C-alpha cells in the first residue's frame, strides 16, 4: 500500500507517534516519505546482506529476522515479513523500540539527511487529523 501524506499522518497519530519520546509527528511522516516514499511494501537489499523493510525501512541485521542475514540480532523480536503489511502496527511498534535507543531517529539515514533540521511540522500541515 502507498499511503497519502495526510493519510499516514493520521494513521501514525492513531498509532501514538505524535510526540513519542520527544519526536513530533512531522518527523515520522517525513521519515516515511524519504525512506520508502510512503510504500509499505518497499524493500532494499544492502551490501552486507541485510535488507531494509517496509514504510520505515527497518533493517534485518539489527531489528527484524528475515532468516537470510548474517549476524542478525532481531532486536524487535519480529519477523521482517510483518513489517511489509499494509497495516503499520508492527512497523510502528519496532520503530518505537529503535528510537528508544540513545541514537533516536538518527537510525534512519534518510530522515537524518532530509528531515533533521528542517521544518518537519510542514509534513502534517494541511491535513485533517
Amino acid at each position, epitope marked *: 500500500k502507498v499511503f497519502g501524506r495526510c493519510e499516514l499522518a493520521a494513521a501514525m*497519530k*492513531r*498509532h*501514538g*507517534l*505524535d*510526540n*513519542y*519520546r*520527544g519526536y513530533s509527528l512531522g518527523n515520522w511522516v517525513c521519515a516515511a516519505k524519504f525512506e520508502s516514499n510512503f510504500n509499505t511494501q518497499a524493500t532494499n537489499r544492502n551490501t552486507d546482506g541485510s535488507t531494509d523493510y517496509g514504510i520505515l525501512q527497518i533493517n534485518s541485521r*539489527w531489528w527484524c529476522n528475515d532468516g537470510r542475514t548474517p549476524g542478525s*540480532r*532481531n*532486536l524487535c*523480536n519480529i519477523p521482517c515479513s510483518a513489517l511489509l503489511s499494509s497495516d503499520i*502496527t508492527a512497523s510502528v*511498534n519496532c520503530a*518505537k*523500540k529503535i528510537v*528508544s*535507543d*540513545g*541514537n533516536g531517529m538518527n537510525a534512519w539515514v534518510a530522515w537524518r539527511n532530509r528531515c533533521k533540521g528542517t521544518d518537519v511540522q510542514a509534513w502534517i500541515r494541511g491535513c485533517r487529523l
Partner: antibody, heavy 113, light 107 residues
Framework: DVQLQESGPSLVKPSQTLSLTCSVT????????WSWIRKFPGNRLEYMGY???????YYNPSLKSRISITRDTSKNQYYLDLNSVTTEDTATYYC???????WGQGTLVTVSA | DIVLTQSPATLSVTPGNSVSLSCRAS??????LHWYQQKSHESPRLLIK???QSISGIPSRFSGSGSGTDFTLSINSVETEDFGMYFC?????????FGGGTKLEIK
C-alpha cells in the same frame, strides 16, 4: 527460550552501594534492551531505567543520579548499582527486558542499620 | 513526569462477572499505555501493550481500549486466577511511569 534471574545481597546498610545482577539465559544480552524495576512496600512500582543496544542508558530522575546500569557480554549478565542507599530504597527489585515479556522472579533488598 | 491515576483503588467482583479498570494520564500519551497483572510473590505480567494490542499467551477475556489520556482494561467474565493487582504503565515519555494500581478481589 529466555530466562532472567536476579542475584545479590538481600540485606544492606544505609549509605552503601546496593548491587544486583541479572543473569540472562537463552539468548545474548546484545540482542535486546534491558531494564530494572522495583516495587516499594505499598504496591508502588518505579521504573528505574534501562540500557539499550548502543550502550546508552536512561535513568529515572527520581534516583537523583545514584544509579548505574551496566552489561557484561562474556557473562551474559547485566547489573544495577545504586549508591548511598537509605531505608527508602528498601523494595523488591526485578530485572526484565524492555518489551516486558521476560521478567526475573524479583528479589527483596532491605536497607537497615 | 507523566502521572497515571488508576481507579477504583479496589474492586470486588464475583467470578463470572465482568469488570473494567480505569487509568488516566496527566497529559496525552497517544496509545503508549500498557497493562500489567501482578500477584503476591510474583513478578508483573504484561497483559496488553499499546492500549489495545493483544499479547500471545494471555487469555482472550482481557482487552484494552482508549487513547490520549483515558484508558481502560476490561475483563470479560472474571476467573479466580484473575484476582490480584493491575497496573498501567506509559512509555510515551522518559521516565516511564506506573499508575497506583487497582486491586481485584472476590466480593
Amino acid at each position: 527460550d529466555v530466562q532472567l534471574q536476579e542475584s545479590g545481597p538481600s540485606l544492606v546498610k544505609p549509605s552503601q552501594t546496593l548491587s544486583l545482577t541479572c543473569s540472562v539465559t537463552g539468548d545474548s544480552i546484545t540482542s535486546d534492551y534491558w531494564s530494572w524495576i522495583r516495587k516499594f512496600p505499598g504496591n508502588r512500582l518505579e521504573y528505574m531505567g534501562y540500557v539499550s543496544y548502543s550502550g546508552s542508558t536512561y535513568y529515572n530522575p527520581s534516583l537523583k543520579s545514584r544509579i548505574s546500569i551496566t552489561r557484561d557480554t562474556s557473562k551474559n549478565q547485566y547489573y544495577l548499582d545504586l549508591n548511598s542507599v537509605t531505608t527508602e530504597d528498601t523494595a523488591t527489585y526485578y530485572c526484565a527486558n524492555w518489551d516486558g515479556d521476560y521478567w526475573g522472579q524479583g528479589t527483596l533488598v532491605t536497607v537497615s542499620a | 513526569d507523566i502521572v497515571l491515576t488508576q481507579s477504583p483503588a479496589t474492586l470486588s467482583v464475583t467470578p463470572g462477572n465482568s469488570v473494567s479498570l480505569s487509568c488516566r494520564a496527566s497529559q496525552s500519551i497517544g496509545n503508549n499505555l500498557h497493562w500489567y497483572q501482578q500477584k503476591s510473590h510474583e513478578s508483573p505480567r504484561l497483559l496488553i501493550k499499546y492500549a489495545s494490542q493483544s499479547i500471545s499467551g494471555i487469555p482472550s477475556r482481557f482487552s484494552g481500549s482508549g487513547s490520549g489520556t483515558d484508558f481502560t482494561l476490561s475483563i470479560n467474565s472474571v476467573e479466580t486466577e484473575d484476582f490480584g493487582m493491575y497496573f498501567c504503565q506509559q512509555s510515551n515519555s522518559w521516565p516511564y511511569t506506573f499508575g497506583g494500581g487497582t486491586k481485584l478481589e472476590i466480593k
